[PDB]
Amino acid sequence: SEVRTIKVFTTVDNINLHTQVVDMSMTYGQQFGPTYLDGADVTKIKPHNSHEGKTFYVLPNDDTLRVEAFEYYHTTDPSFLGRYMSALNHTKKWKYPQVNGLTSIKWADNNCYLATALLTLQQIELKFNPPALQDAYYRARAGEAANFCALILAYCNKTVGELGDVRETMSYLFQHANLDSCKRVLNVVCKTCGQQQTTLKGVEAVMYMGTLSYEQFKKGVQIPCTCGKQATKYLVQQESPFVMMSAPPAQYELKHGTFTCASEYTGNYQCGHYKHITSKETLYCIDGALLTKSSEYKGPITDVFYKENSYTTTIK
Ligand SMILES: Cc1ccc(NC2CNC2)cc1C(=O)N[C@H](C)c1cccc(-c2ccc(CN[C@@H]3CC[C@H](O)C3)s2)c1
Ligand SMILES: [Zn+2]
């Protein structure tokens, strides 16, 4: 039969586009291997006329693309790009309303942990290392978050429709962000053992599991010693843009202007519901596209974020 062709562009990063000529007999998979158009999988689909001039994502099958993909995504996981496109295919159908001047996500496919994490990122000082996240985050901040939510799902290895833990998500995100200058100094005192001082850098310096209260962390918290007698661990110095204080969900009271934002978890382990509480002129509770205001909030809190620059203890 007659040989028909169109010109298209193939890419890994949507920065470097490569012109390709395609046969309208064969499928995209036959010609380039797995292929995607705005996340949809067209590997088994033959070219259409409307496809002419459009940009397609493909897998790296030569050194140029591999280098391009690594520089942009800072990963070599060969499933990464297929999971990103697979996820994006769903995240592009989500609605990202501006609630309180921050970008949220209308609830779908248990995205309540992603709404809350996205709302948190817009409230704390953070620079991602992978250009893919820098670029998607900047678009997200301005109300186009479908690529950011797709990359988060891809980086966190989560499927659409699966509920995730906000503390884990953020931890993964922190690992891909520049926190080299973040420092924390802890002191532990035991009447028997003595005083021991430890320094922490990066992600370890901005996160803590076992108390929501930044103030309690500075007074001291009780922890079990190696010896077995109770010991007091307290914060001596902290240099970071913020601190994330986590604990298993507990009835907690949040007071206006004593924190930046908090994750509220209702329900049971890995099958519950997240809400985002932020401190502005009053307390705002953001629940996807839903918003309510109050001067006071008691409820089950699991993460609390506090802004910070430089703290030093006046203890001893
Ligand atoms: C939602 C979710 C998804 C995935 C995972 N995956 C695991 C792999 N990494 C973690 C976790 C969770 C999770 O549920 N997290 C919450 C924070 C959480 C964390 C830890 C403990 C709990 C709970 C324990 C008991 C729970 C029910 N009771 C509430 C607690 C006191 C309130 O009065 C009522 S939740 C949850
Ligand atoms: Zn001890």
Curated annotation (Swiss-Prot):
Q: Topology relative to the membrane, per the entry?
A: Multi-pass membrane protein
**In the UniProt annotation, what is the result of changing Y269 to G/T?**
Reduced inhibition by GRL-0617
Q: Where is the Peptidase C16 domain?
A: 72-316
Instruction: From the Swiss-Prot or TrEMBL record, state where the protein is found.
Output: Host endoplasmic reticulum membrane
Taking every annotated instance into account, which residue ranges of this chain make up the domain Ubiquitin-like? 3-58
User: Which chemical reaction does it catalyze?
Assistant: Thiol-dependent hydrolysis of ester, thioester, amide, peptide and isopeptide bonds formed by the C-terminal Gly of ubiquitin (a 76-residue protein attached to proteins as an intracellular targeting signal)
How is this protein's activity kept under control? Inhibited in vitro by GRL-0617.
Note the effect listed for C112A: Unable to remove host IFIH1 (MDA5) ISGylation
Can you tell me which residues form the catalytic site?
C112, H273, D287
ZnF locations on chain (C4-type): 190-227
Domain of life, source organism: Viruses
Q: Where, by residue number, does Zn(2+) 4 bind? A: C190, C193, C225, C227
Q: What does this protein do?
A: Responsible for the cleavages located at the N-terminus of the replicase polyprotein. Participates together with nsp4 in the assembly of virally-induced cytoplasmic double-membrane vesicles necessary for viral replication. Antagonizes innate immune induction of type I interferon by blocking the phosphorylation, dimerization and subsequent nuclear translocation of host IRF3. Also prevents host NF-kappa-B signaling. In addition, PL-PRO possesses a deubiquitinating/deISGylating activity and processes both 'Lys-48'- and 'Lys-63'-linked polyubiquitin chains from cellular substrates.
Subunit structure as annotated in this protein's UniProt entry:
May form homohexamers. Interacts with N protein.
For this entry, the protein name equals Papain-like protease nsp3
Q: Which organism is it from?
A: Severe acute respiratory syndrome coronavirus 2
